[PDB]
Amino acid sequence: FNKVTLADAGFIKQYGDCLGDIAARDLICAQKFNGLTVLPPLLTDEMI
Amino acid sequence: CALDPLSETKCTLKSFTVEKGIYQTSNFRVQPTESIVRFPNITNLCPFG
Amino acid sequence: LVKNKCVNFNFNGLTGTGVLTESNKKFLPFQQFGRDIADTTDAVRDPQTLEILDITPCSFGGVSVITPGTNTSNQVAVLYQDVNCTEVPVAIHADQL
Amino acid sequence: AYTNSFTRGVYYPDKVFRSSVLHSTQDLFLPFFSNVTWFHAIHDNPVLPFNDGVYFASTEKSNIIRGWIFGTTLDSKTQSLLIVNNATNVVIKVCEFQFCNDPFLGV
Amino acid sequence: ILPVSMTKTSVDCTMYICGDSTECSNLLLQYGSFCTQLNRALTGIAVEQ
Amino acid sequence: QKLIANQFNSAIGKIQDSLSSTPSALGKLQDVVNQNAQALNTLVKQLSSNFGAISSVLNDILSRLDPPEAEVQIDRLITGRLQSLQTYVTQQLIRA
Numbered sequence: 001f002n003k004v005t006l007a008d009a010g011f012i013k014q015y016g017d018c019l020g021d022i023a024a025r026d027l028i029c030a031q032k033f034n035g036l037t038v039l040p041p042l043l044t045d046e047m048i
Numbered sequence: 049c050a051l052d053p054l055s056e057t058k059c060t061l062k063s064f065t066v067e068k069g070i071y072q073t074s075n076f077r078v079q080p081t082e083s084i085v086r087f088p089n090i091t092n093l094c095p096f097g
Numbered sequence: 098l099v100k101n102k103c104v105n106f107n108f109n110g111l112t113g114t115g116v117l118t119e120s121n122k123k124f125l126p127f128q129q130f131g132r133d134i135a136d137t138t139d140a141v142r143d144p145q146t147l148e149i150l151d152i153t154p155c156s157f158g159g160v161s162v163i164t165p166g167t168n169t170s171n172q173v174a175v176l177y178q179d180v181n182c183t184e185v186p187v188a189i190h191a192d193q194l
Numbered sequence: 195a196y197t198n199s200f201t202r203g204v205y206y207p208d209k210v211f212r213s214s215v216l217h218s219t220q221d222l223f224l225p226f227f228s229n230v231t232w233f234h235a236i237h238d239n240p241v242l243p244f245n246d247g248v249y250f251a252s253t254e255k256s257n258i259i260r261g262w263i264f265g266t267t268l269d270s271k272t273q274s275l276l277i278v279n280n281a282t283n284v285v286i287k288v289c290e291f292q293f294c295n296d297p298f299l300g301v
Numbered sequence: 302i303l304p305v306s307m308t309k310t311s312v313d314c315t316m317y318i319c320g321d322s323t324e325c326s327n328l329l330l331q332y333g334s335f336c337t338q339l340n341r342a343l344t345g346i347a348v349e350q
Numbered sequence: 351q352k353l354i355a356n357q358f359n360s361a362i363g364k365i366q367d368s369l370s371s372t373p374s375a376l377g378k379l380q381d382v383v384n385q386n387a388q389a390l391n392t393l394v395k396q397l398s399s400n401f402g403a404i405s406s407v408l409n410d411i412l413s414r415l416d417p418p419e420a421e422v423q424i425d426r427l428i429t430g431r432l433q434s435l436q437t438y439v440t441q442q443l444i445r446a
């Protein structure tokens with residue numbers, strides 16, 4: 001799980017960076033990348 | 049098409065019956081919408097006249 | 098402007114539009130208005146107050162609709178996109194809807 | 195003289211607030227690893243051409259290099275340019291004027 | 302090592318094309334249902350994953 | 351049974367280090383992800399072309415030209431961005 005990295009993957013990584021966790025009170029990160037959204041998978045990692 | 053979401057689903061689904069599932073009908077809750085401006089002080093008028 | 102809705106922040110030109118974002122980072126003497134990977138004007142320096150201020154575009158997430166069959170029942174329930182529940186109706190601008 | 199400019203000539207080519215990205219500009223810029231010319235204690239102050247731009251800074255010995263003045267003809271046929279230092283700020287100046295080639299002010 | 306699935310994306314056709322401009326949307330309406338087609342294809346992929 | 355047990359256990363340990371070493375055997379995995387992203391980045395960058403218009407950002411075009419003129423500029427931008435979207439979707443389908 002560590003040999004696969006997203007560091008040099010611009011949009012996906014920086015969309016994953018809408019988890020500032022307090023950094024901005026009102027961050028709707030679906031209104032920051034102009035419609036480009038990423039749905040979550042039906043199955044997590046723990047269940048696989 | 050503006051009612052309990054069920055209705056707008058029927059709208060998009062183009063049928064007056066819907067099955068069991070989910071449907072993206074997003075961006076449908078009207079935006080904040082005002083009209084104003086901020087600027088500077090350029091007291092001098094032009095000589096165009 | 099206002100500082101909470103799509104007041105159309107027309108900061109010295111650019112008809113920037115965006116709710117909230119009372120943002121703050123760092124700039125430079127030349128540095129005036131923000132620009133990201135896609136130029137997305139990050140922040141700006143107000144024409145007559147002169148500071149730093151980023152803003153998120155018209156900030157309203159997306160909605161889908163769960164359903165049992167239309168004829169199975171008329172009940173529905175909506176599932177949004179990534180939005181903390183705190184701002185749900187206010188994050189769908191419930192007031193006018 | 196002629197020396198390898200290992201890496202110099204990088205100036206914000208813009209005035210837009212930018213942050214952790216990688217932008218690919220396209221403008222006049224000092225060609226890397228290129229060369230330069232100059233002079234030394236010759237007595238000096240020669241003339242030199244301008245093309246489009248001139249990356250130019252130097253060993254300020256004890257501040258001795260003072261100001262860089264332009265001026266194509268100096269028969270006073272063009273209000274060109276002149277820059278030195280007048281306490282508060284440099285004497286930005288324009289007028290076609292004498293172009294006293296060897297600065298002097300008493301000092 | 303075998304790949305099994307990939308990232309599920311989706312895109313707001315109107316936001317991408319005419320983002321927030323209500324004069325642009327009325328012009329987009331002249332091209333028929335292209336946004337609907339695109340969203341349909343993307344949804345198909347997202348379920349396939 | 352004695353030394354088939356050993357061989358097995360040891361070899362598993364090998365797989366462990368081998369992976370850890372740095373072969374990203376998960377290359378056949380990385381690609382996919384990256385490949386996708388690249389496709390996204392292009393799409394995003396495609397928002398700066400003006401496809402023949404006098405500018406790119408809609409807000410401006412709207413903020414400079416009257417509606418009757420706006421028509422031209424707007425339409426061209428629309429066609430350009432529509433084509434970008436179409437290409438992206440078709441590529442996604444193939445990769446799918």
Ligand SMILES: *[C@@H]1O[C@H](CO)[C@@H](O)[C@H](O)[C@H]1NC(C)=O
Nearest residue numbers: 087088089090144145146147
């Ligand atoms: C412009 O004038 C207003 C007075 O209404 C003042 O509040 C503001 O600071 C001025 N801005 C300047 C001088 O840049």
Ligand SMILES: *[C@@H]1O[C@H](CO)[C@@H](O)[C@H](O)[C@H]1NC(C)=O
Nearest residue numbers: 067165166167168169170171
């Ligand atoms: C909806 O229609 C299907 C098809 O006949 C039927 O099986 C189902 O019972 C209907 N729903 C209800 C609540 O009766």
Ligand SMILES: *[C@@H]1O[C@H](CO)[C@@H](O)[C@H](O)[C@H]1NC(C)=O
Nearest residue numbers: 021022025180181182183184
């Ligand atoms: C939503 O916002 C509240 C208020 O700050 C916070 O306590 C909560 O943790 C947030 N939700 C998540 C999932 O972080």
Ligand SMILES: *[C@@H]1O[C@H](CO)[C@@H](O)[C@H](O)[C@H]1NC(C)=O
Nearest residue numbers: 196197198199227228229230
């Ligand atoms: C620059 O000067 C060096 C000598 O230091 C010489 O080798 C080179 O040809 C000159 N020109 C360049 C680097 O363009």
